[PDB]
C-alpha cells in the first residue's frame, strides 16, 4: 500500500466516513452519537460534485488539521482535527494524494447534520476552538527518547487518536489534558484507564498481552468490544508489528493516573467458588417466559452459563472468554459489563468474526429487562469480577439511553 493509504489506515479515517459495512467507503452518512445530537460524516471521496474533489492541498490541510471547511464553515469536533492538527506536512500531503488518486469518487450526498439550538450555527465553534487550545505545531521528534517512543507517541496522539476516547473531556467537551488517557465515558461505553498505573491502568499488563490485544483484540484477560472492536478491526489489525511495538513502547511511558477505590488490577480478580442450585430450579418448571426467576445465579445459568461456564471461566480453547480475571468484569466501573450484556460483542479480525449476541430489549436470542440485566451483572461482579462494584436497573437504563447526559447538552432544551 502507498504511504497515503497507510496513513489513512493508521488514522482510521475510513471507519467514520463509511456508513457501516455497506455504504461505499469514504462516502459519509455515518451517524455519530454526540451529546448534542447526531453528527453525520461527510463525503470525502474525490467527487467534484458531492465530495471534496474541488479541494486544494491547502484546503485539505485546513479541513484536516484546523477544522475549517472549504466554504470557511467550522467543522464539528466530532472530526478529530484536534488530534490531526500536529500531523506533519508530508503526512497531510500523502493523505491528500491518497484521497485524490486512490479512492474512487462516489456521487451520493450524505445526510446533513441538524443540531438543536444553539449548536445549529457552526460559527460559535471558533470560540470553542480558542477555549480548547488545539493549535498545534506540527509534530517533531523528541531527541531525548528513541525513535520507537517518538513513533509510538505520533501513532497514539496524531494518527490513532486514542485520547479521543481515553482522555476525559471537561465541561466544554474539550480534552482534559491533565487526565491524559485516564479513562472516559464515550456514550454507552467507557474507554478505561490506559496509563502506566499498575492497578488503575494497563501498567500490570504483560507486553505480549498488550501487543496481542492491540493487534487482535483478544487476550486471556481482555476482549475488545464496542468502539474498541471497531478501532482494532478497521485500523489496528492492519498496522505493522513495528507500529504496535512502538505504540506499546510509548504506552509503557505514559505517566500513571490513579482511579479511586482501586487495589488490584482489573484482570487480577479471582473467582468465588460459588454457583447456583439445580434443585431450586425444579419449582420453576411449567413456568415459561421466565419472570419468576429473580435469582442472579439462576438467571446467569439460564442465559450465560452455556458459553461462559458455570464457574465463569469460559471454554478451554479461549473462544468464550473467562469472566474470572477479565478486565471488563474486573472494572470498578461496571459500565462496560452492562454494555456488553446489552449489545453483545462483534469483532472481525483476519476475516474471522467473534460474536456474542445482544441481550437488550431488541435481542433476538433472549431479551432481558433492566432488572434482569442488573441482577445478572451483580452476580457476575460478586462471583467473577469486581466485588466492590454494583449495578442497578437505573444504571442499565442510562446505558441504554446512551450514557449520562453531559451538562452542556442541557443548553439545547
Amino acid at each position: 500500500i502507498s504511504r497515503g493509504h497507510y496513513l489513512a489506515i493508521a488514522a482510521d479515517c475510513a471507519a467514520c466516513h463509511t456508513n457501516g459495512r455497506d455504504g461505499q467507503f469514504l462516502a459519509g452518512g455515518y451517524a455519530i452519537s454526540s451529546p448534542m445530537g447526531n453528527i453525520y460524516s461527510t463525503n470525502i471521496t474525490p467527487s467534484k460534485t458531492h465530495g471534496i474533489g474541488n479541494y486544494t492541498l491547502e484546503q485539505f490541510s485546513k479541513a484536516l488539521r484546523h477544522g475549517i471547511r472549504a466554504d470557511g464553515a467550522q467543522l464539528y469536533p466530532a472530526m478529530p482535527y484536534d488530534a490531526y492538527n500536529r500531523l506533519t506536512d508530508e503526512d497531510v500531503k500523502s493523505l491528500y494524494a491518497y484521497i485524490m488518486t486512490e479512492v474512487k469518487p462516489v456521487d451520493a450526498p450524505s445526510p446533513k447534520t441538524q443540531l438543536p439550538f444553539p449548536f445549529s450555527i457552526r460559527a460559535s465553534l471558533g470560540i470553542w476552538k480558542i477555549a480548547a487550545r488545539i493549535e498545534g505545531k506540527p509534530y517533531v521528534f523528541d531527541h531525548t527518547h528513541n525513535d520507537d517512543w517518538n513513533r509510538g507517541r505520533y501513532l497514539v496522539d496524531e494518527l490513532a487518536h486514542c485520547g479521543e476516547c481515553h482522555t476525559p473531556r471537561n465541561f466544554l467537551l474539550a480534552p482534559n489534558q491533565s487526565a491524559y488517557l485516564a479513562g472516559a465515558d464515550i456514550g454507552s461505553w467507557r474507554a478505561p484507564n490506559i496509563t502506566n498505573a499498575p492497578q488503575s491502568g494497563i501498567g500490570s499488563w504483560s507486553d505480549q498481552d498488550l501487543f496481542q490485544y492491540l493487534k487482535t483484540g483478544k487476550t486471556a484477560h481482555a476482549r475488545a468490544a464496542g468502539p474498541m472492536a471497531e478501532a482494532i478491526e478497521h485500523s489496528l489489525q492492519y498496522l505493522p508489528d513495528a507500529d504496535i511495538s512502538a505504540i506499546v513502547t510509548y504506552l509503557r511511558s505514559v505517566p500513571a493516573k490513579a482511579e479511586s477505590g482501586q487495589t488490584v488490577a482489573n484482570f487480577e480478580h479471582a473467582g468465588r467458588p460459588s454457583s447456583y442450585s439445580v434443585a431450586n430450579a425444579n419449582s420453576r418448571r411449567s413456568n415459561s417466559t421466565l419472570t419468576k426467576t429473580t435469582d442472579g445465579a439462576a438467571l446467569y445459568e439460564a442465559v450465560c452459563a452455556s458459553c461462559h461456564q458455570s464457574d465463569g471461566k469460559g471454554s478451554k480453547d479461549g473462544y468464550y472468554p473467562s469472566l474470572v480475571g477479565n478486565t471488563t468484569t474486573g472494572q470498578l466501573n461496571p459500565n462496560d459489563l452492562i454494555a456488553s450484556i446489552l449489545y453483545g460483542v462483534d469483532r472481525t479480525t483476519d476475516n474471522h468474526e467473534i460474536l456474542m449476541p445482544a441481550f437488550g430489549p431488541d435481542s433476538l436470542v433472549q431479551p432481558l429487562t433492566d432488572e434482569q440485566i442488573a441482577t445478572i451483572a451483580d452476580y457476575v461482579l460478586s462471583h467473577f469480577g469486581n466485588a466492590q462494584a454494583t449495578v442497578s436497573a437505573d444504571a442499565v437504563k442510562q446505558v441504554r439511553a446512551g450514557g449520562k447526559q453531559v451538562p452542556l447538552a442541557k443548553l439545547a432544551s
Partner: protein, 540 residues
C-alpha cells in the same frame, strides 16, 4: 376487544405466520398476528430442559420443556396428554409433536431446511402416484432462496452430493465440518453403497443475523441455549419491531362470511373464554397441518355447513407425514455421537428414482444426539457398581447408535382429521382426531428400508439391535388443505388462496400436495412468502 382492525390478520405465530407477517409489515401493510399460545423465553425453556429428568432426555422428550396451556394445549407423549387422538392401523405414526406459542413448533425443531426435488412437485405426472403440486419447483425457487437467506441456512456449497434440487445461488453459509460420528458413518455407509451427504440446516456455521456461531450444544431438539439456529420467534420479533401487533393467547374459533363467501370477521377466545372480534381486509390461517383444518372445520357456517373452505369435502383429508422406522444398537467400533448438531448428515441416495412408481422413496439418517444420558440410564439399569459402572457408561456413550429411515406417504382421503366427538379442552373446543394408514406404498418401501437398516447395523457390527415394529411420527404435517387447480378437487390454489373464499389464504404445510422425502418446513416457509406476494398484489 372492540374490533381489532388491520389490513391482514394472520392466525398463528409460527415460522410460516411470522415470516408472512414480517414480509407484509416490511411492505407497508398493517398486520395483526394472533397466537393461541403464550409468549415464551428461550432461557426458561433451557432451564426447564436441564431440570427435566434424564430418562426424559434419553428418550427424546421434546415437549416437556414447553409448558402446555389449558386454553391452547399442545401434544405431550411422556405421559400422553391425549390432546391429539390417533386411530387406524398406523396411529403410532401420527403421534406428532407441536408447540403452541409465539414462535410455534419451530421453537424446538432440528432446523433441517430442505429444498424439494423438481420431480417432487410433479409426482403423479412423473410416476403416476399421489398428486401434482399446483406450481413447479422453478416457481418456488426464488421463495426458497428468500426463506434460506432470511433463516440463515448453511449447506454443502461446493459438492455434487447426488441428483438434488438445482440452485441458482449458493447457500448463505457453507456447512460446518462433520463431527466424528458423522465422518465414521459416512465412510461406513459409503463402503455399504449409500451416499451420506450433509444436511442443509438453518444453523450458523459463522456469526449470522447478529446471532452466534453454532458451538455444538447438540440440543437443537428441543432448545438451542444460544440462538445459533433459526426459530420463528425471530421473524415474529422482527415483524413486531416493524409495527406488527401480536396478541398471544388468542384462540381463534369462529369465522363470518358474507354473501360472496368472503370472510368479514373472525372471533377468538382469551384464557377466560371471553370473545373478541377481529375485522380485516385479508385473513390468513397459519396454524398447523393439524390446527388449520381443525379451525376450518370448527368454524362451519350456515353458508359453509361442512366447514370453512370445504366445498370439495377435502379439509382434513389427505393428511401426510414421513413415516419412520427407528433402530438402535451398540456399534463394535466407537462412534462418539454428539459432535456438532443433532442432525448433521443423511443418506440422500434414495430420494429419487424410477422405483417411485411402485414404492416410496426414502431418507436414511444417523442421529447425532449425544448418547451420554442414554448410556448413563442404561448402565444404571444393569445394576453395575464402582469402576464397572463408569466403564459401562463410557463404552455405551462411545458406542450407542440411533438410526432412522423415513418414507414418503401418498395423500389418502381416508387419512382424515375430523373433530373428535369425545374430547374437548377448557374453552370447549373439540380435540383433533386423525385416522392414519401408511399404505402399501410405504409398506413396500419399508420392506426394503428394514433390510437397509439391518445392513447398516451389520456393517457396524452392531449388537443389541432394536427396531421399532411400528411406524414413527416425524412431525412434518402436510396435507389437510390440499392445493390444486380444480376447485372440486382441492382447497387452495397455486397462490395458497382458498377456492371458496377469495379473502382467505392458508399459509401452512397442509397446502402441500406431496410429502416428499425430506423435512418440509422450508417448503412451508417458501409457500408462505409466495402467499405474501399474492396478498401484497391483492391489497395494492
Amino acid at each position: 376487544n372492540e374490533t381489532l382492525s388491520a389490513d391482514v390478520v394472520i392466525i398463528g405465530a409460527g415460522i410460516c405466520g411470522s415470516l408472512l407477517a414480517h414480509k407484509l409489515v416490511r411492505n407497508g401493510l398493517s398486520v395483526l398476528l394472533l397466537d393461541a399460545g403464550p409468549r415464551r423465553d428461550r432461557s426458561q425453556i433451557v432451564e426447564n430442559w436441564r431440570n427435566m429428568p434424564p430418562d426424559n432426555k434419553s428418550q427424546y422428550d421434546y415437549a416437556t420443556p414447553y409448558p402446555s396451556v389449558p386454553w391452547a394445549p399442545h401434544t405431550n407423549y411422556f405421559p400422553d396428554n391425549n390432546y391429539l387422538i390417533v386411530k387406524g392401523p398406523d396411529r403410532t405414526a401420527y403421534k406428532q409433536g407441536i408447540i403452541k406459542g409465539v414462535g410455534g413448533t419451530t421453537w424446538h425443531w432440528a432446523a433441517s431446511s430442505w429444498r424439494y426435488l423438481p420431480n417432487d412437485f410433479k409426482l403423479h405426472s412423473t410416476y403416476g402416484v399421489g398428486r401434482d403440486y399446483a406450481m413447479s419447483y422453478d416457481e418456488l425457487e426464488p421463495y426458497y432462496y428468500e426463506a434460506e437467506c432470511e433463516m440463515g441456512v448453511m449447506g454443502p456449497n461446493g459438492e455434487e452430493i447426488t441428483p438434488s434440487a438445482p440452485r441458482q445461488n449458493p447457500w448463505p453459509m457453507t456447512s460446518m465440518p462433520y463431527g466424528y460420528g458423522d465422518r465414521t458413518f459416512t465412510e461406513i455407509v459409503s463402503k455399504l453403497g449409500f451416499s451420506n451427504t450433509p444436511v442443509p440446516q438453518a444453523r450458523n456455521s459463522r456469526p449470522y443475523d447478529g446471532r452466534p456461531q453454532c458451538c455444538g450444544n447438540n440440543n437443537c431438539m428441543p432448545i438451542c441455549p444460544i440462538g445459533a439456529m433459526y426459530n420463528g420467534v425471530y421473524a415474529a420479533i422482527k415483524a413486531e419491531k416493524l409495527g406488527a401487533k401480536i396478541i398471544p393467547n388468542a384462540v381463534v374459533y369462529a369465522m363470518e362470511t358474507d354473501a360472496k363467501n368472503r370472510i368479514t370477521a373472525i372471533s377468538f377466545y382469551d384464557p377466560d373464554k371471553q370473545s373478541h372480534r377481529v375485522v380485516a381486509k385479508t385473513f390468513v390461517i397459519a396454524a398447523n397441518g393439524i390446527e388449520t383444518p381443525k379451525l376450518l372445520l370448527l368454524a362451519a357456517n350456515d353458508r359453509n355447513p361442512h366447514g370453512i373452505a370445504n366445498s370439495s369435502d377435502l379439509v382434513g383429508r389427505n393428511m401426510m407425514d414421513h413415516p419412520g422406522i427407528g433402530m438402535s444398537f451398540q456399534s463394535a467400533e466407537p462412534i462418539w455421537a454428539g459432535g456438532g448438531s443433532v442432525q448433521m448428515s443423511s443418506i440422500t441416495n434414495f430420494r429419487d428414482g424410477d422405483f417411485r412408481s411402485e414404492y416410496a422413496a426414502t431418507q436414511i439418517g444417523y442421529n447425532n444426539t449425544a448418547q451420554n444420558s442414554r448410556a448413563g440410564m442404561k448402565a444404571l439399569s444393569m445394576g453395575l457398581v464402582g469402576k464397572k459402572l463408569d466403564e459401562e457408561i463410557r463404552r455405551r456413550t462411545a458406542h450407542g447408535v440411533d438410526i432412522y429411515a423415513n418414507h414418503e406417504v401418498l395423500p389418502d382421503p381416508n387419512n382424515r382429521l375430523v373433530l373428535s366427538k369425545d374430547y374437548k379442552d377448557a374453552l370447549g373446543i373439540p380435540h383433533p382426531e386423525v385416522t392414519y394408514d401408511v399404505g402399501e406404498y410405504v409398506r413396500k418401501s419399508a420392506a426394503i428400508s428394514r433390510q437397509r437398516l439391518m445392513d447398516i447395523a451389520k456393517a457396524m457390527g452392531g449388537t443389541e439391535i432394536e427396531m421399532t415394529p411400528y411406524f414413527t411420527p416425524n412431525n412434518h404435517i402436510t396435507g389437510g388443505t390440499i392445493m390444486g387447480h380444480d376447485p372440486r378437487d382441492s382447497v387452495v390454489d397455486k397462490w395458497l388462496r382458498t377456492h371458496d373464499h377469495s379473502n382467505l389464504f392458508l399459509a401452512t404445510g397442509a397446502t402441500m400436495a406431496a410429502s416428499g422425502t425430506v423435512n418440509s418446513t422450508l417448503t412451508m416457509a417458501a409457500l408462505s412468502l409466495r402467499a405474501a406476494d399474492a396478498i401484497l398484489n391483492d391489497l395494492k
